[PDB]
Write a protein that binds this ligand. Structure first.
Ligand code: PLP
Ligand code: PLP
Ligand code: AKG
Lengths: 285, 290
């Protein structure tokens, strides 16, 4: 019955899946995480997510105590044990327990945890530009998908109070960065632009969509953009594992085009759907 | 006997003190914390620490589900139950569990934890000889991204800094902020002494330290010339003395920065004086546990 959580090789019922309060992952958000979809029995972009996890751990100087290969098998086993076919997966690696101070050298053993949960619109999201700026590349690099997500939560708090489904960050230079958990793209006179990934995160969904754009031969640039570009865009959409491709039909109360998902967004959304149908790593095989 | 840990009113044996993996404090470092010292049956600056806890919670829009008096009582109750007289206290309030996503409105029940342990002075046998400090390449979290004044569960900025100092020959990391101003150590405030004058950064780009506040009180009482002002690398490299402050560390002298000898190479006169006046305060003040 009850969903099981992978916890260091053990499979434990959801309601009992718990970590020592002395884990630095808990005390200090000292760890990294991923987000992964399974569609109809296949895991989409499994190895792109695992590689990013290992990069993020490396950036925080954390050794994940599983080879990448064992990590992929643990993800598939966790899904099998729970009999999932359509699912959202959340791997997490933490520093493990130490003493009460910051020093990671006192933390001999990382915890590895994998959560699995069973699993757009023709309306579109209302996006809100936030006062809080993205974490800076030289303080808490935003490319690290770490458990330090309070930057993102502050932005989400603002979007909640200010009539937004989604918060849009700028960085310190005034460049558009990304949504609180999704990359951003705009479309203007048939050309698509998205920020370079430096001040945001190297999204897997963003990467797939760049591939689709190049398959459709739509003019494309990866270039820094600003408010002026957001407020005069023909279309706007955000991307991420959970949201997939989500049209953004309003920005700060301003209607984007006619307020309905745009042509280019919709083409990308259907090419992206085929891809999630036809490619992935089969769970039951 | 095993140490007990407060968990929403329950007192749980240390080794069974555990948090659901679904708690947003664990998924997202979505909470705040404190650090408090009990010295010989008293809790030093109990109420101040509690005030800061509540301010930090308000900054993250997190409603602590105890009144301040209840929180104080919980801290004292946890210490009593452990028969502790000398302790480090780590209270923690998190957002609790909600959806898997980051939306805090979907999280109905904050989670309140209070750890109490004996825990030696951070530095801990370096107070006679002094710390070797290293300025780090990583800058402090910016005031308009992740305000460094929040004592939050998002401490990877501080940890990245500590990792650099580990690899680069230092006991402590010194942050600058994005302007090039000196900010603080990874876990403590910073003071410098030059020609008899003490300078410390305004707290905006660092953290409003309770120890730093006590030291400033001491500086004023001792009538030492004192300035709260932004400073840079030039000031660090030319200082007669350097020291850092925090609950765990107390007052620690810094005798090397980036391998350069600070004055003498041993704790300065002003630092040692303040260290002595500070020990006195830890003896005469506090809320009685028993
Ligand atoms: C996970 C994440 C993304 C999107 O990444 P995908 O790999 O497409 O799921 C974007 N921004 C932030 C801040 C994230 O945490
Ligand atoms: C807790 C803390 C300090 C020192 O605060 P006190 O109230 O003196 O203990 C300084 N800097 C940082 C980053 C901290 O987390
Ligand atoms: O140890 C830390 O995480 C930061 C500093 C602190 O909490 C303290 O001085 O008690």
């Amino acid at each position: 019955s009850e969903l099981l959580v992978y916890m260091n090789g053990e499979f434990v019922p959801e309601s009992q899946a718990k970590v020592s309060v002395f884990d630095h992952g808990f005390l200090y958000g000292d760890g990294v995480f991923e987000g992964i979809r399974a569609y109809n029995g296949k895991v989409f972009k499994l190895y792109e997510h695992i590689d990013r996890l290992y990069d993020c751990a490396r950036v925080i100087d954390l050794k994940i105590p599983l080879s990448k290969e064992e990590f992929a098998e643990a993800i598939l086993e966790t899904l099998r044990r729970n009999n999932l076919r359509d699912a959202y997966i959340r791997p997490i690696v933490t520093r493990g327990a130490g003493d009460l101070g910051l020093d990671p050298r006192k933390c001999p053993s990382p915890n590895v945890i994998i959560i699995t949960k069973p699993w757009l619109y023709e309306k579109g999201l209302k996006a809100i530009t936030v006062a809080i700026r993205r974490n800076a590349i030289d303080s808490l690099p935003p490319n690290i998908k770490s458990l330090n997500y309070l930057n993102n939560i502050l932005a989400k708090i603002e979007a909640n109070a200010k009539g937004g489904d989604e918060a849009i960050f700028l960085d310190h230079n005034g460049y558009i960065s990304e949504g609180s958990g999704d990359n951003i793209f705009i479309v203007k006179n048939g050309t698509i632009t998205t920020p370079p990934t430096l001040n945001n995160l190297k999204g897997i969904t963003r990467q797939v969509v760049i591939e689709l754009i190049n398959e459709l031969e739509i003019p494309f640039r990866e270039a820094n953009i600003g408010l002026f570009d957001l407020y005069s865009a023909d279309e706007i959409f955000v991307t991420g594992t959970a949201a997939e491709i989500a049209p953004v039909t309003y920005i700060d109360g301003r209607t984007v085009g006619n307020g309905k998902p745009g042509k280019v967004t919709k083409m990308l959304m259907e090419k992206f759907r085929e891809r999630t149908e036809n490619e992935g790593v089969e769970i039951y095989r």
